[PDB]
Amino acid sequence: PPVKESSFVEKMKKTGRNIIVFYGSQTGTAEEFANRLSKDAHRYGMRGMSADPEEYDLADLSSLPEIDKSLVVFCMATYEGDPTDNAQDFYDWLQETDVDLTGVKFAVFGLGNKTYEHFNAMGKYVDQRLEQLGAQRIFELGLGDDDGNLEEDFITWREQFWPAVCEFFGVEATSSIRQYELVVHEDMDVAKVYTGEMGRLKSYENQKPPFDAKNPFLAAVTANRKLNQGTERHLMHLELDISDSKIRYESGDHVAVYPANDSALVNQIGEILGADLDVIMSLNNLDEESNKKHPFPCPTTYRTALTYYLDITNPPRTNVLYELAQYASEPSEQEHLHKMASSSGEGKELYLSWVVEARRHILAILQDYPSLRPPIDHLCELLPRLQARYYSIASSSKVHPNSVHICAVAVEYEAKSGRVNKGVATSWLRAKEPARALVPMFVRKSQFRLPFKSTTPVIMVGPGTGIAPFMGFIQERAWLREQGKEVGETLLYYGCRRSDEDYLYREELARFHKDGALTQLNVAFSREQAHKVYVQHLLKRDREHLWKLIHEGGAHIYVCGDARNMAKDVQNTFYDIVAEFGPMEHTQAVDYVKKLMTKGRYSLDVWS
Ligand SMILES: Cc1cc2nc3c(=O)[nH]c(=O)nc-3n(C[C@H](O)[C@H](O)[C@H](O)COP(=O)(O)OP(=O)(O)OC[C@H]3O[C@@H](n4cnc5c(N)ncnc54)[C@H](O)[C@@H]3O)c2cc1C
Ligand SMILES: Cc1cc2nc3c(=O)[nH]c(=O)nc-3n(C[C@H](O)[C@H](O)[C@H](O)COP(=O)(O)O)c2cc1C
């Protein structure tokens, strides 16, 4: 129950703002777009502000007309067909309210992903809803797809948005501007310098519950072992101690962690910029009105920002490269960086393959464009924030109330940029050894859950790391039997490359099968023969029986793992199963399946 800020309209009035951009974001993408749109306002004679809708009462939109040439934009991302956490209040309000928004001008840009059933659902709603309430759309709804390239969809929409804005309000197209000012600190107590904590100063040292995204709990790594047998890759199992954290969790929930960048990568960035990473400083908002005093916990050292608060590995967005251009002394290199923001032509094509496709991180760009030597402080201002990574808890709270398990594949690949890229969180996690190695973390509740009725059949499909949440399920179902409860069939459809290469939890799964915790352990080994053998091939094999459990046993279906292809193929296989046994046409099988998803009997936990 957050305490709302006062009317945003009155703040707009007091600060001569005429445009406000709200962001529905969870990973900071929509939040970046909002700030870019808000900043853009200046280049058109207007002045805007960015804002988290959760901190305000959107009912005040009805007051927006009181401002001449006022306008509100919504950059909303979608999550499982739902609004982001910070946009829930707004969502619920849009449904219940009946307020008249006559005179209100708006525009919406949604951040979606096409390979989802509910693509840009939130943006579609906000856009349609504001109009029903009586507001008037000032520019078409933007439909951004992260499946293709979201950054590009945004550029295209944006490039057309402002001209429309200008034409309607009749404003002219009226300049590198810093958002913060640098303040070095030659001397000051070490007790007031942030060293990586995410919120309250010294919150990592002095831990006080409850713990969450703002006040993560530093859990000790009690176990970290290699799960796979072979050496092709590195899959690992970690156990985090959460005793005395008061944290509650259930199988199906996710555990997030705040990682630390590679120190060598941090040191190189400083070295190539001739900067002293150990300088203590702060970046204070040049706009004293905003509640955002700094871009990250300050005061702090550059080293610390680059290590715990900044994203130095994902490809830089076009606006960041656009601003850096000024710092490239070699003409041709300044030109390339400047054109990265293009909505077409060689500039766009160059950005797409040389930066995105090749996965060049900031350091790589600084090395391939040697004339580019920006001042460290302005760089830290442009870089996006370092995000937490989520992992499907691999343990059951019934069996391990004080411990959270993680099952992850360490990311490390050859990038077309020529260098080897390392995953921020997994590299960091992998290096944690039980001593007091700690991991900042918090739990996030999910809807991925075992059936309430212990007798309800369970069908789990989780190839590769998709097995994670299922180890928790199996433990819990095994615990239920020990507890004298009556458990229905528990079926696992797992998959890996080779039984002697990356068969995760081989020994543990064998045990559960032996004791009957698992009614069936169906494993598809994709590479032990010439043709591929996948989990869906096993589902098809056991189609008759699966149908029986589904249509007559009320079994719950669970799919975890890769969302690009595996989840879809598994889904298609279930369509064919229903269609054959119902029986019914494909179209009716798709409806039947989707229904199971709404009635909570077909759940997902996939990612990319
Ligand atoms: C809800 C949810 C549940 C998840 N559960 C788990 C889980 O239980 N176990 C688990 O292992 N992961 C899981 N993940 C993934 C996890 O959150 C991280 O994305 C993953 O561990 C990699 O993070 P990282 O920081 O190590 O790598 P990052 O530094 O975040 O890099 C990730 C990016 O590297 C790029 N990349 C990876 N390989 C290549 C390549 N070969 N070529 C080009 N680009 C590539 C991709 O853009 C990828 O997005 C889950 C994610 C979500 C959202
Ligand atoms: C767990 C998860 C669930 C998602 N669910 C959806 C979804 O239902 N629909 C959709 O269009 N996009 C979905 N996406 C994609 C995001 O909408 C897209 O990546 C967006 O750019 C994220 O913006 P943010 O960083 O501002 O939250 C999902 C992404 C993740 C990681």
Three-class SS state of 224: strand
Q: Does residue 288 sit in the same domain as residue 409?
A: no
User: Domain ends where: 173, 195, 229?
Assistant: 173
| CATH (domain of 602) | 3.40.50.80
Binding site membership of 65 for ligand 2 (Cβ less than 6 Å)? no
Q: Does residue 46 sit in the same domain as residue 163?
A: yes
Buried b (16+ CB within 10 A) or exposed e, 169-185: beeeeeeeeebbebeeb
Binding site membership of 28 for ligand 2 (Cβ less than 6 Å)? yes
Catalytic residues: 392, 560, 605, 607
Method used to determine the 3D structure:
X-ray
∠ CA 247-249-250, nearest 5°, is: 165
Residue located nearest, by CA, to atom 34 of ligand 1: 423
Residue 191 forms part of a structural domain: no
Q: What are the C-alpha distances in Å from 1 to residues 26, 89, 246, 443?
A: 18, 10, 20, 18
Question: Residue 497 corresponds to which tokens in the numbers above?
Answer: 């490359």
Q: Does residue 20 sit in the same domain as residue 147?
A: yes
Alpha carbon of 517 to ligand 2 centroid (Å): 35
Alpha carbon of 180 to ligand 2 centroid (Å): 30
| CATH (domain of 303) | 1.20.990.10
Query: What φ, ψ does residue 85 adopt, rounded to 5°?
Result: -55, -45
Residue located nearest, by CA, to atom 14 of ligand 1: 391
Residue 198 forms part of a structural domain: no
Binding site membership of 224 for ligand 2 (Cβ less than 6 Å)? no
Binding site membership of 150 for ligand 2 (Cβ less than 6 Å)? yes
Named by the residue before each, gaps in the chain exceeding 2.5 A from C to N are 174, 435
| Ligand in nearest proximity to the CA of 410 | 1
Binding site membership of 467 for ligand 1 (Cβ less than 6 Å)? no
- Burial class, 514, CB count within 10 angstroms (exposed 0-12 / middle 13-18 / buried 19+): exposed
Q: Does residue 167 sit in the same domain as residue 47?
A: yes
Q: Does residue 374 sit in the same domain as residue 424?
A: no
Q: Does residue 68 sit in the same domain as residue 28?
A: yes
Residue 94 forms part of a structural domain: yes
Q: Does residue 215 sit in the same domain as residue 337?
A: no
Residue located nearest, by CA, to atom 18 of ligand 2: 112
Q: Does residue 303 sit in the same domain as residue 436?
A: no
Q: What is the DSSP string of 85-126?
A: GGGHHHHHHHHH-----TT-EEEEEEEE-SSSSSTTHHHHHH
| Ligand in nearest proximity to the CA of 412 | 1
User: Domain ends where: 365, 385, 405?
Assistant: 385
Contact 106, 141 (CB under 8 A): no
CA distance 52 to 603: 30
Residue 236 forms part of a structural domain: yes
Q: Does residue 301 sit in the same domain as residue 221?
A: no
Residue located nearest, by CA, to atom 43 of ligand 1: 415
Alpha carbon of 31 to ligand 2 centroid (Å): 13
| CATH (domain of 228) | 2.40.30.10
Binding site membership of 446 for ligand 2 (Cβ less than 6 Å)? no
Question: Residue 390 corresponds to which tokens in the numbers above?
Answer: 């989520």
CA distance 236 to 309: 25
CA 19 to chain centre: 27
Residue 101 forms part of a structural domain: yes
Resolution of this entry in Å? 2.4
**Could you identify the residue written with the tokens 């098809």?**
540
Find the largest Cα–Cα distance for the chain. 77
Q: Does residue 281 sit in the same domain as residue 224?
A: no
Which residues partner with 441 through β-bridges?
217, 257
User: Domain ends where: 397, 428, 448?
Assistant: 448
CA distance 376 to 310: 12
CA distance 17 to 23: 17
Alpha carbon of 300 to ligand 1 centroid (Å): 28
Structural domain for 90, as ranges: 3-173
What total number of domains does the chain contain?
4
Q: Does residue 305 sit in the same domain as residue 280?
A: yes
Q: Does residue 396 sit in the same domain as residue 300?
A: no
